Design a binder for these strands. Structure first.
Ligand SMILES: Cc1cn([C@H]2C[C@H](O)[C@@H](COP(=O)(O)NP(=O)(O)OP(=O)(O)O)O2)c(=O)[nH]c1=O
Ligand SMILES: [Mn+2]
Ligand SMILES: [Mn+2]
Ligand code: NA
Ligand code: NA
Length: 326
DNA sequence: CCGACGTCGCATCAGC
DNA sequence: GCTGATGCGA
DNA sequence: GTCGG
């Protein structure tokens, strides 16, 4: 954490441009610069040194100079005491609330935590639940708790159909000592790129995980993606565990490796990999890696049978999950 | 300079 | 009801 | 905001 103050500054700038300015690319530029600096093994002595890194240009270099000299950045000081910006930035932290909904909520005077509670009738379902567990969602999950949840999910899954395979991707698979949520890839042999030989495949798993009071809430649900809330069971006389966000993704069994690559992350690592795939003339999603034609239009799925195979096509040495934490 | 910036799932709304 | 765009999220 | 070309 050598360059902690800097990466925080850029991350805060990223949040600003996303939530307030609604400038998504600026937001990704800051997050990209913060990431490349995050894994820079030196304590940066000057902006020009940082400018030697990709994703770090003139404007950020100048801001880094200002930060390194004063210990602060004036643009952020101004933003911090801007009440509208501070209000919008806050509302966006509630799940289901983005820059647009936050901005309009502020136009109605709804700009604090109680504002959201007394005006509960103005939220859709996602925002209602996202506010219901705002406090709990702020807490991280120690890896120890992640391990408990994986036993439950994997065993409950086993009980519905023993051919379900369930893998816990996300930062957990990246070996993080603490995660922000739980991410689960799911594969049943009846669901391939060829056919859905069984309906309700994901529904029945959600159903089972609700029966055991593991999944307490749903933010959204489809035939391939679930977004909701879970909770570890506490013993007698114990304070309850915080409610945890959970994501479940049903991906066609034969397209597992593109799926496990996608959901393992990190999100930036992905964005850099897929952007590199393009420069090599490939396009990767959670399903397939495919070549790009002479006209841009992608061709047929190339054969993939390992995580490493996808790294090969784009001329990248395989990086274990632990090393994708950009 | 400038075009492009990973890719896609669900909720939701506009328009028909 | 559907198609496509938009908002928010993975 | 950055950068390839
Ligand atoms: C949010 C998000 C996720 N993803 C992919 C990569 C993430 O690793 C994976 C899971 O989403 P997440 O749980 O929001 N990210 P996380 O598991 O990497 O980090 P954390 O430990 O939950 O905070 O999905 C993207 O590719 N773009 C995104 O914007
Ligand atoms: Mn996660
Ligand atoms: Mn997640
Ligand atoms: Na640079
Ligand atoms: Na949000």
């Amino acid at each position: 954490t050598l360059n902690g103050g800097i990466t925080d500054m850029l991350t805060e700038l990223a949040n600003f441009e996303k939530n307030v300015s609604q400038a998504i690319h600026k937001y990704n530029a800051y997050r990209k610069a913060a990431s490349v600096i995050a894994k820079y093994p030196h304590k940066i002595k000057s902006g020009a040194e940082a400018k030697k890194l990709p994703g770090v240009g003139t404007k950020i270099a100048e801001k880094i100079d200002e930060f390194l000299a004063t210990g602060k950045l004036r643009k952020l000081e101004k933003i911090r005491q801007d009440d509208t910006s501070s209000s919008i930035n806050f509302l966006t932290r509630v799940s289901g609330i983005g820059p647009s909904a936050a901005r309009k909520f502020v136009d109605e005077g709804i700009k604090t935590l109680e504002d959201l509670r007394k005006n509960e009738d103005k939220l859709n379902h996602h925002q209602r639940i996202g506010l219901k567990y705002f406090g709990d969602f702020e807490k991280r999950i120690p890896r120890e708790e992640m391990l408990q949840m994986q036993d439950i999910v994997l065993n409950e899954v086993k009980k519905v159909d023993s051919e379900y395979i369930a893998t816990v991707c996300g930062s957990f698979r990246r070996g993080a000592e603490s995660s922000g949520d739980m991410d689960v890839l799911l594969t049943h042999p009846s669901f391939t790129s060829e056919s859905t030989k069984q309906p309700k495949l994901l529904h029945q798993v959600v159903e089972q995980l609700q029966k055991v009071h593991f999944i307490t809430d749903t933010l959204s649900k489809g035939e391939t993606k679930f977004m909701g809330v879970c909770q570890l069971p506490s013993k007698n006389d114990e304070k309850e565990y915080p409610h945890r966000r959970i994501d479940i993704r049903l991906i066609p069994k034969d397209q597992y490796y593109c799926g496990v690559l996608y959901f393992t992350g990190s999100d930036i690592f992905a964005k850099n990999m897929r952007a590199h795939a393009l420069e090599k003339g490939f396009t990767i999603n959670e399903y397939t890696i495919r070549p790009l034609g002479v006209t841009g239009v992608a061709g047929e799925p190339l054969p993939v049978d390992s995580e490493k195979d996808i790294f090969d096509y784009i001329q990248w040495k395989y990086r274990e999950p632990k090393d994708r934490s950009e």
